[PDB]
Structure formats: C-alpha cells, structure tokens
C-alpha cells in the first residue's frame, strides 16, 4: 500500500493565495444563520438571522438596503433564484415562504412540514423547490401550485443540508444519521448511499464545475464524485470540529468554517490545507460566540462572506501580493492516516 504513498509525493499541488479580512459589518440583533447572494448582478446579500428578519446588504459598500420581516422565529435558510425574481426563505416556524423581489412581499406559503425546516435549494431547470428539516424527509415542492409533489423518505434522522443538480442525482442530502444520499426523484428512491462519515454531516457544497460535492462532518471533510458516486478525495483535517459550513470558489478553493472560529481554507483538487485563520471575536462578545455559521462566495469568487455567531457579517478578500515570495502554506506533508 506504500505505492499509494509514493503516488502522494509526486503531485505537489496547486498553489493559491492566502485570504484576509476586508470588511466587518455589524447590524443584526441576533446571530446570522444563513447567507445567499444575488446570482446575477452580485449587487447584494440576503442574510437570515436569529432575530427572524432578513437584511439585504449591498455587496459593494456594505450598506444596508432593506429589511424583510415576516417570520416569527429564526431563519435557518435562504435561497435566491436564477431564472426567477424570487427569494425562498425558510425557518424554524415550519414554513417555506416565497418572496417576490419586485414588490418585496410574501407571495406564497408552502405548507406541510411537521417541524422546523432547515434547508431550501432551488432546482436549476425545473421550477421546483427542495425543502428539508427535522421531518427527516425531503419535500419537492411545485413552485407554481404549492403542491408538495414528491416526498423522499430515507434518512433516519434530521436533514441538515440539501442540494439540487440538473442531471442524475437531482437531490443530494445529508443528515444526522451520518450519511449522504444521492436521490433519484422520478422513481423516488435512493440511487446511492454514502456512509463514510462517522457523525452528523452538517454541511455540503457543490463544486460549480467538476460535478461533485464536498461533504463535511466533525473532523473530516471528504469529497464525492456524483454520477458514479465514488469517493474522489479526502481533505487533511486534524480536529477542526465542528465544521458548520463549506463553500467552493470557482478557482477550486474549498472553504471550511469552524465552530472553534478557525477558517480552514483548502485546495479542492489535492486535499491540502494551505491556510488557517482565527477570527477576532468582537468588542464585548464571549470566547464561545466566536464561530462561523454560514458562508458563501460571490459569483466571481474573489470575495467571501461569512456570517458569524457574534452578530456580524465579515467579508474576506484574497490578497493580491502573494505569489511565491511568501505565500507558502503548510506545504504538503501527507501524514499517515
């Protein structure tokens, strides 16, 4: 098996540049649970909160455009649509609310979850929604008629994170039973199961190009090829736990947000970790409140936006000096597994 270990010493992977802190935006009253970005113009954020609101921030200057209230409890997830001028928000109040970006008012309510709904993902080509939460089932909603067309029974526990893809498996899901299922919706049953995680899979992200997914757990961030459902790679992680979120830049950079406040950046190809940061908590906060609840990259991928549990949004920019003078990160030593 050493042959594999030699074949890890040939590659010498993929240089990138480090990241640093451009901007800090206070202004939420509670935690910031979720963040999504205008998929077309990159002009703004929609950020959930733990105060029930949603505050639309301008990406350029960081000023606050508007506030969207309308949920009675915390907002776990928000997702904005490409083809539509719609914004689907979803919360712990058992409800998935549509939002018409034109007039800024709730249009539709989808009904039928038994309990808090922690994930929404908008299918790219079908005019569907996929919602999930402590129900332990994934509900495929018809966007127009508000009919929960398909239900996907499967995971034996709550469902943390859900994604949508145009070809087969059209829904990828991840649950606290420590599995990740790759669904075939037309037949309505699991196409493939990926069990390799040891504990709750609390975050996923789709690579914008390669047609793969990055799954997380406490200490181990793996990757997965879709289609076949193979394992692709692993990522070097000593205890970073807990990994709350993942995000994949267009340059094949894989972000990992910690609950210990550490920002662990990776190369996606290799598995190498080229940088680790630690955020500054805040003026009057607690050392417990330093963590990263969500994150995303803009459409370009040269900026990073992380909502943190200290009631602040932080915007991380990629250094322009860098190159080989002194970038080099931890520099590729594959320890024995």
């Amino acid at each position: 098996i050493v042959n594999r270990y030699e074949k890890l010493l040939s590659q010498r992977p993929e240089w990138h540049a480090p990241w640093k802190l451009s901007r800090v935006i206070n202004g939420h009253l509670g935690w910031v649970r979720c963040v999504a970005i205008d998929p077309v113009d990159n002009e703004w954020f929609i950020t959930g909160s733990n105060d029930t609101t949603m505050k639309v921030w301008d990406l350029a200057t960081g000023k606050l455009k508007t506030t969207l209230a309308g949920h009675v409890m915390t907002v776990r997830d928000v997702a904005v649509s490409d083809r539509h001028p719609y914004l689907f928000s979803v919360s712990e109040d058992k409800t998935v609310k549509c939002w018409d970006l034109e007039k800024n008012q709730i249009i539709r309510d989808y009904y039928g979850h038994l309990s808090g709904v922690r994930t929404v993902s908008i299918h790219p080509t079908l005019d569907l929604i996929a919602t999930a939460g402590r129900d332990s089932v994934i509900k495929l909603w018809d966007m127009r008629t508000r009919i929960p067309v398909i239900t996907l029974v499967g995971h034996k526990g709550p469902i943390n994170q859900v994604q949508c893809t145009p070809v087969d498996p059209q829904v990828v899901s991840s649950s606290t039973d420590a599995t990740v299922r790759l669904w075939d919706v037309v037949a309505g049953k699991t196409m493939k199961v990926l069990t390799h995680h040891k504990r709750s899979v609390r975050a996923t992200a789709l690579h914008p190009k390669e047609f793969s997914v990055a799954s997380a757990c406490t200490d181990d961030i793996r990757s997965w090829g879709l289609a076949e459902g193979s394992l692709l790679t692993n990522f070097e992680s000593e205890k970073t736990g807990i990994i709350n979120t993942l995000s994949i830049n267009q340059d094949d950079v894989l972000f990992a947000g910690g609950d210990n406040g550490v920002l662990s950046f990776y190369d996606y190809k290799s598995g190498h970790k080229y940088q680790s940061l630690a955020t500054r908590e805040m003026v009057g906060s607690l050392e417990g409140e330093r963590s990263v609840l969500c994150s995303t990259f803009d459409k370009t991928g040269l900026r990073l936006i992380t909502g943190e549990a200290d009631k602040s949004i932080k915007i991380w920019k990629q250094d322009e000096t860098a190159t080989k003078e002194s970038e080099p990160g931890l520099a590729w030593n594959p320890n024995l597994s």
Binding site: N26, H84, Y86, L114, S136, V137, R144, V153, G284
Partner: protein, 68 residues
C-alpha cells in the same frame, strides 16, 4: 413522560391515505410565475459599541425611562 427525545418522521405520514379536505389557503392564488431575463462667578462649581444586550446604551436608556 416529558420532553421530545425524538421528532416525528414524515415517513409515517407518507404512507397514509389522503382525506381530500379542501383548505382555505390552497385555493388558487398567484397562478402565474415570473421569469427573469459677575453673577456667573459666585457659583460653587463649573468655572462606542459594546456587543451585549444588557450593557448596551440603548438598554440603559430604556430601563432608565420605563421604570421611572
């Protein structure tokens, strides 16, 4: 005999037979999508964001007032 220890799996509700009662909120509405494209002297005297709810300034204003 108290608290949750679990939640109810939607899987159960998936196998039941439908009733077909007609609710008020599923009546058709928004039925069409949208696609994108000298006196003074004699006197005796005289000549910032903390993150927390209780210790903020607004709060001490609040309780400083409503409690009279």
């Amino acid at each position: 005999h108290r608290p949750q220890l679990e939640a109810r799996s939607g899987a159960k509700a998936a196998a039941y037979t439908p009733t077909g009662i007609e609710h008020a909120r599923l009546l058709p509405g928004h039925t069409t999508l949208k696609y994108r494209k000298s006196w003074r002297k004699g006197t005796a005297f005289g000549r910032g964001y903390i993150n927390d709810m209780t210790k903020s300034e607004y709060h001490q204003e609040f309780l400083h007032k409503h409690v009279r």
